[PDB]
Symmetry: C2
Subunit: 482 residues, 2 copies
């Protein structure tokens, strides 16, 4: 009762009830456009890193209602056989346009756009949000942390702290995309090809009862040695014992260094560095793992801590300070009775809290001469900035802040992934995604990617797109006048 | 590269490297006891609700290294064939004792205990933590929220906001255990048998362009009608239109009520109640869904909001204010050279931040006469309070706070689940778990389960258990004297 063989019902019940309402009344194949976007920059970071495309692609390619799916809906929920045969025959026939994994993405712009039969668009929203919200959030958190670390290793060590198992594997993949250098999760190494990393735990040390014997046991059985030194006493017990083992084993091991999981690291690591150096191990590194995030790491570095490798657990994999992105999936255009597409709106008070209507594209604008970031320019589908000598970029709320831009490149961010349910996009390798992310981040102007108080990245609606929104808003507010 | 057919490598790499170190040196089958516990009450709640046992059981029953598992370890990580054949032949042979799902659980007491070969115990820690940390956390969050709501429905609606897909399905199951009445997640209904619930979305309304036509379309195609009224204007558009549809359809539908997803609900819901009542729909309910948690819900109720049903999204399913439980899995006893078990310790400064050593049991103490909660009493394995006329319960830090207890019942909390890898525990149905949770909560003394400033539930170490800890701590601190 019943077999977990399918993600097709990983959705909100109200989607199936709406699909029924559409289908019974002959409106399931009305033409719709839906868009996915978030409203606020996560962590107030200067940029976000998109993740979730490979996950979504696999989901959409397997989007059929299984025998057990239908049996549940028939036997428990008592849907009629007519509707059920519609669901049995269902195959995905929407166009999907998306940012690619590793793209920089920002608030108030479409990141994924689904276009096709209303009922099919409706089915996919919940699962897409579930996967994209989380994966983008962790990729951005890892970028945030990696930015503060610099070139030194960031190791994603948070599986034990993650919000169930998918979170651990797909989160760690997203972390690698966003800036982690390795994972602890062996299975994520297996299935994604992420480099895998480890040291040892206190349990090894306690199994012997002293540091020397445990470090020796590890040295006898492994080439690459990082010794965890704080089981009993970092300075008096662990570090001297690590040094003793390193001396006795010589070049038969790599003494990569020592891990410290406790204490005030801004004092502890400084004295440990001295101990290693005075013993002649001036290349042995100090690995830290306790309570790390972009804030404590930045402080530790600025205090002149001597830490070379950062194993980050809880705060990265759960995005602990803001554990949800707040992406939403909204209907922006729908086929009217006359067969023509109509811009659709929901009212709020804050006219910026209102979803911008219309089928849109996002154009990343840069200065041709030196590739300077000029911001994103969000158009209706019928505008192509590439054919315009000059564009008018204004802030959508603060419209008195504005510039005419000439001599620019405009790159369309939403790419075809499926056309009418047919995949036209070849999935990159994970390393290619990570390289793509690095290059995109490297190209972003320093002001938008700096760690402290980044400049706000413009996301501007075209004159036409903005006028369409405000005219529709005006029209509905006046319709609600009576 | 390679097939995701297995959870056996869903672990930290350092576990496999330790298993190798144990195995090569003939110590893999040393006898070990490991215990899982958390240090702080999540959300500062008065109690926690344990979840994760069914999940763990399924994991442990399938704990074999697959062909693709071994191929990864051979081809990528280059482990030796000897060790690999050990892993190929691996079968789980540990005893597992656990709290049951729906048990009340507290900080600083073992909740799961694994006993058997050191190398096997080591393998399972990471996955167990991943699943139990999250599921217990969400079950407790749901209890917390449900406590503030009272008898009215709590609906878990957060799939779209969850941290990837496992989080959504297993989180929603945990929410049902802890106090939710239904889920939106259809797949969780399918595979777990949770009651499933829904209304409709704004997209239905926008597909028509007005409330009346969309509410009518929904009424023509469904018996149970909840109309979402805030697409355009709750008071002027949606609620009058819902009322019109209700009037026109009469007893051909159930007009269950109206959903409001926006506005100040403490004003909005009061006026909506008036509108429904004045129209003669004094049984139609008001459903709220926006930005809900135990805090905003409590405030809304205390402001005399007229809300009857609570659809909770982000803050429940992600445990947003504290998205990790902080459970850890620690070696407490290990076979020594002489073949006898030895209490094992790791030093910290705070002697309460030190893991209590020894194989332990947790006894829930109640007064026989009226079943009053007296707290938990954590013993070494060789003490059975049931055979003692009187027990001495003292606070482990504040030892001057203490009582002798007579005429008590002592119930052992850790139950046999696997004996030497063999399942002796029959899995309850989800409804039986939820009933068990309800009854356990109902039996907890009011002071420990009250919403505001609950009394701290005693978790006391027996005289023997406490003396063992402090003597070992003293011994190691004096060993570190030189
Ligand atoms: O390899 C390690 O040191 C490690 C990995 C995950 C969690 N804690 C430690
Ligand atoms: O902040 C913006 O959106 C902006 C800034 C400069 C010029 N145009 C728009
Ligand atoms: O059924 C609903 O009303 C619902 C379910 C999940 C998320 N939002 C709304
Ligand atoms: O808080 C405690 O642990 C406690 C309270 C009363 C008596 N004994 C212990």
């Amino acid at each position: 009762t019943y077999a977990d063989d399918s993600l097709t019902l990983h959705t909100d019940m109200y989607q199936i009830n709406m699909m029924q309402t559409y289908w019974e009344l002959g409106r399931a194949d009305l033409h719709a456009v839906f868009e996915c976007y978030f409203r606020e920059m996560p962590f107030n970071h200067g940029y976000a890193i998109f993740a979730g495309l490979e996950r979504l692609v696999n989901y959409l390619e397997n989007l059929t209602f299984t025998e057990s799916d239908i049996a549940y809906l028939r036997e428990v929920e008592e849907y009629p056989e007519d509707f059920l045969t519609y669901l049995a025959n269902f195959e995905f026939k929407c166009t999907v346009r998306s940012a690619l994994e590793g793209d920089l993405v920002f608030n108030n712009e479409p990141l994924i756009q689904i276009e096709g039969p209303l009922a099919q668009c409706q089915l996919v929203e919940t699962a897409l949000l579930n996967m994209v919200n989380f994966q983008t959030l962790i990729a951005t958190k890892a970028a945030r942390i990696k930015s503060v670390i610099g070139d030194d290793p960031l190791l994603e060590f948070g599986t034990r702290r993650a919000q169930e198992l998918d979170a651990a594997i797909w989160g760690t993949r997203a972390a690698y995309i966003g800036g982690a250098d390795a994972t602890s999760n062996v299975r994520a190494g297996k299935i994604f090809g992420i480099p895998v990393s480890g040291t040892h735990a206190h349990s090894l040390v306690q199994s012997y009862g002293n540091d020397y014997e445990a470090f020796m046991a590890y040295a006898k059985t492994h080439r690459d040695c990082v010794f965890l030194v704080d089981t009993y006493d970092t300075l008096k017990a662990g570090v001297p014992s690590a040094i003793r083992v390193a001396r006795e084993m010589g070049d038969k091991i790599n003494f990569l260094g020592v891990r410290i999981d406790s204490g005030d690291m801004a004092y502890i690591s400084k004295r440990v560095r001295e101990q290693l150096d005075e013993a002649g191990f001036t290349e042995a590194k100090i690995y830290a793992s306790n309570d790390l995030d972009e804030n404590t790491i930045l402080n530790l570095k600025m205090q002149k801590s001597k830490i070379d490798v950062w194993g980050v657990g809880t705060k990265l994999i759960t995005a602990y300070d803001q554990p949800a992105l707040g992406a939403v999936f909204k209907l922006v255009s729908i086929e009217g009775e006359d067969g023509q597409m109509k811009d659709t709106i929901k009212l709020s008070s804050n006219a910026e809290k209102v979803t911008t209507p219309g089928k849109k594209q996002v154009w990343r604008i840069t200065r041709k001469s030196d590739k300077k970031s000029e911001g994103d320019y969000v158009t209706l589908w019928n505008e192509d900035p590439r054919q315009e000598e000059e564009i008018y970029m204004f802030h959508p709320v603060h419209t008195f802040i504005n510039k005419y831009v000439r001599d620019f490149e405009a790159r369309p961010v939403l790419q075809d992934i499926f056309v009418e349910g047919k995949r036209v996009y070849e999935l990159p390798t994970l390393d290619e995604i990570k390289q793509y992310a690095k290059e995109n981040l490297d190209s972003l102007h320093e002001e938008y990617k700096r760690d402290l108080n980044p400049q706000k990245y413009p996301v501007d609606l075209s004159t036409d797109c903005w006028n369409h929104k405000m005219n529709l808003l005006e029209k509905v507010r006046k319709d609600v006048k009576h």
